[PDB]
């Protein structure tokens, strides 16, 4: 038969949906069925000249390209092209061109290109190669190295009721092939598809500003039950807006269902619905009861109307979004807020303010900040959308690697009419300690203390910070921004460091880190996080300097000792051990007053005796283990890990009135 091959390269291991997908779509008509064989796909990274050599008497290779993986799989066609001349290059994924331009001139060995949802497109492709290719909709044509767009592409109707490659096995070698190699995967699934709002920067299943269509109901819930029964415990659901929908309690309830009657799946990622309701309220609750729940999406991207109308978007308002965090933190029930840095019209003002508002707000645990990438099908990714708003962008290596032409790249960007580069790389730094000083704890409940007991503003604590140990180059806080200054103009600069690999492609960031661990992905939040862990006393030390110049001298507060001492004990710290607990004494109820009671100088002992952490309390100290300690204080770089970090569990700590 014809051999198909599929190429879809993920640097994680995710399962070959889009593979499964086409084929089974495909396959119903029987001709194709009979004349075609479908090969199992490859997905995993291997060395480009072996991807290469394994695709053997090829009729057709079928590339599934996005930003992680399209250079290199232009260059597998290149080379099997060179050795099957008669092989039809089918190219689709959001990072295939919707308007192709020149493409061909670039890849003369390529032939079709399929835009947005291909099930369609490929199917056609695939009878017209047996039948006695510019008639195909959704395509465009390879004519010499020119250009020639098919007719529109015909989507699958508002009922989606297609094959599901999980419950006709065609999934089972992906699963196996992970499980031989001893890799854990993520199994991908979509219960809808598109996303009815326009957020420039994005190209969300290559389907924004579109109406949305359902899987159909019984093909879901069978394959519910197919991830429980086959013991897939990492789910992902690609939907752009999970609870936007009716169904999706329902969808909820059945996947809490199969875990507890299965006990699988085990984590669910998905992002919720940007207009968050009851519905995304009672999906967290029912997850969060049931340890499926990885964090509801409240995400916002800027916090300021000018970049918000710029970019098409509308986001809940401040105050409803405070109503939103006390519901949720009433009910310990984990969110996150994403922020795009360098957004148009973006300003270092307005963005160092919205972080300030969102902490105001009562987001202190969990806050996101991307680099702006320009996706090819983005609608911000055209000349006039540039232009108006002066987005400046240099390539990016997205990985450390090597020829050029096999390093994945994206355009990212570093500098707008609003927004000077110098300004960029200030804010970039500002976000990150943020992130390990607040969301990581160290400072986080000082900072609450002094916004709420001595009018020191959450913006202007952390630009206080940064202004003044920017100026104290032999701090500990000092030398984390001075060192994400020149870092961060060094990635502009500099192409090749990476976006995904920036901590360890840099010997020195590596080696501070070396004794925690071994990893790729470290963040510049894991860094900054471990640095202080490594210079925590010296840190606290310097911090009251800094407290001083605020005209707030802990030597003749005693209110602001007993919080700085508070503030100090509540960290996990290397040496602690869940046999031996810890305790301490204080002026005041700290772990009432950081609940959200009033503040009272009542003399308290605190015992703290956390026996593990993380978000499954699934990582247990180990005391001098400084690997166990890296767990339970951070947890992994990728995910990220935010729920149940950084500091003791006051809220369940053994306080008593001395
Ligand atoms: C799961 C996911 C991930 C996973 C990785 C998944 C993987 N390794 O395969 C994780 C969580 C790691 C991830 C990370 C990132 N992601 Co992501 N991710 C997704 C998500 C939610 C689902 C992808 C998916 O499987 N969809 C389901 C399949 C069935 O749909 P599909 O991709 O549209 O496929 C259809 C068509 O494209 C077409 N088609 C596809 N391949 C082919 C091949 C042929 C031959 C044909 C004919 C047709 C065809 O037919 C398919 C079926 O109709 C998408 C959004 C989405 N819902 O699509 C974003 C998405 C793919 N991610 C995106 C981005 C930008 C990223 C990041 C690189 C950056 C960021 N998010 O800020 C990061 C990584 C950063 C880093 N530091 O490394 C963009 C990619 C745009 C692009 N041009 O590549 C998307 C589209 C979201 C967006 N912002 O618009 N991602
Ligand atoms: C899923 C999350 O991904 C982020 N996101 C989506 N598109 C882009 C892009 N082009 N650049 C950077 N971040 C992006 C948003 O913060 C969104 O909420
Ligand atoms: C998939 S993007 C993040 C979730 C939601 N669509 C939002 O923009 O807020
Ligand atoms: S950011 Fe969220 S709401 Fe906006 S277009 Fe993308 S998926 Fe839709
Ligand atoms: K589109």
Redesign the pocket.
């Given at each position: 038969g014809r051999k198909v091959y599929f190429v879809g390269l993920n640097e994680y291991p995710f399962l070959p949906l889009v593979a499964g997908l086409l084929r089974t779509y495909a396959e119903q008509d029987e001709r194709i069925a009979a004349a075609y064989d479908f090969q199992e796909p490859v997905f995993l990274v291997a060395p480009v000249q072996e991807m290469a050599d394994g695709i053997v008497e090829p009729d057709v290779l079928a590339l599934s390209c996005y930003v992680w993986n399209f250079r290199r799989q232009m260059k597998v066609a290149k080379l099997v092209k060179e050795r099957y001349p008669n092989v039809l290059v089918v190219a689709g994924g959001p990072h295939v061109p919707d308007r192709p331009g020149n493409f061909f001139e670039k890849h003369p060995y390529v032939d079709v290109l399929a835009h947005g949802e291909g099930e369609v497109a490929f199917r056609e492709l695939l009878a017209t190669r047996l039948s006695d290719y510019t008639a195909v909709p959704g395509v465009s044509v390879r004519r010499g190295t020119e250009a020639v767009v098919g007719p529109k592409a015909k989507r699958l109707p508002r009922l989606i009721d297609t094959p599901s490659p999980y419950l006709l096995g065609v999934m089972d070698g992906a699963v196996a092939t992970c499980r031989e190699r001893g890799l854990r995967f993520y199994a991908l699934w979509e219960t809808n598809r598109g996303?009815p709002?326009?957020?420039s920067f994005?190209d969300?299943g290559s389907a924004?500003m579109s109406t949305l269509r359902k899987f159909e109901d019984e093909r879901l819930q069978d394959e519910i039950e197919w991830f429980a029964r086959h013991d897939v415990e990492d789910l992902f659901i690609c939907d752009?807006?999970f609870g936007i929908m009716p169904r999706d309690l329902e969808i909820a309830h059945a996947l809490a269902e199969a875990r507890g009657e299965l006990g699988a799946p085990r984590q669910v990622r998905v992002?919720f619905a940007?207009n968050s309701n009851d519905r995304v309220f009672d999906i967290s609750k029912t997850w969060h009861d049931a340890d499926l729940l990885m964090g509801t999406t409240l995400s916002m991207?800027s916090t300021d109307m000018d970049v918000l109308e710029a970019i098409d978007?509308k986001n809940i308002g401040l105050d409803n979004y405070r109503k939103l965090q006390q519901r949720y933190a009433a009910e310990n029930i984990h969110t996150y807020t994403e922020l795009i840095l360098g957004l148009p019209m973006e300003t270092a003002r307005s963005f160092r303010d919205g972080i300030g508002s969102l902490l105001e707000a009562g987001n202190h645990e969990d806050l996101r900040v991307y680099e702006l990438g320009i996706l090819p099908n983005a609608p911000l990714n055209t000349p006039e959308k540039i232009e108006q708003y002066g987005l400046r962008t240099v390539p990016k290596r997205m990985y450390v690697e090597t020829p050029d032409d096999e390093a994945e790249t994206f355009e990212m960007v570093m500098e707008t009419n609003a927004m000077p580069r110098d300004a960029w790389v200030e804010s970039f730094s500002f976000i990150q300690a943020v992130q390990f000083l607040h969301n990581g704890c160290y400072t986080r409940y000082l900072s609450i203390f002094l916004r709420q007991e001595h009018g020191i503003g959450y913006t202007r604590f952390y630009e206080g910070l940064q202004d003044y140990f920017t100026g104290r180059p032999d701090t500990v806080l000092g030398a984390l921004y001075l060192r994400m200054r020149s870092l961060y103009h060094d990635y502009i600069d500099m192409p090749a460091l990476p976006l995904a690999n920036l901590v360890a492609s840099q010997p020195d960031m590596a080696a501070d880190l070396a004794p925690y661990g071994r990893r790729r992905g470290w963040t510049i939040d894991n860094w900054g996080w471990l640095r202080i862990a490594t210079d925590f006393d010296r840190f606290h030390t310097e911090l009251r300097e800094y407290l001083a110049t605020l005209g707030l001298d802990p030597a003749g507060d005693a209110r602001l000792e007993d919080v700085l001492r508070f503030q100090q004990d509540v960290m996990l710290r290397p040496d602690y051990s869940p046999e031996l607990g810890k305790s301490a004494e204080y002026a005041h109820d700290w772990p009432g007053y950081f609940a959200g009671g009033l503040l009272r100088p009542r003399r308290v002992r605190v015992a703290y005796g956390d026996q593990s952490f993380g978000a499954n309390g699934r990582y247990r100290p180990v005391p001098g283990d400084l690997k166990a300690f890296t767990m339970a204080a951070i947890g992994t770089s990728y995910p990220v890990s935010r729920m149940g970090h950084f500091c003791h569990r006051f809220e369940s700590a053994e306080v008593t009135s001395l």
């Open positions: 996303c709002y326009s957020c994005c969300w924004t752009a807006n992002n940007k991207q978007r």
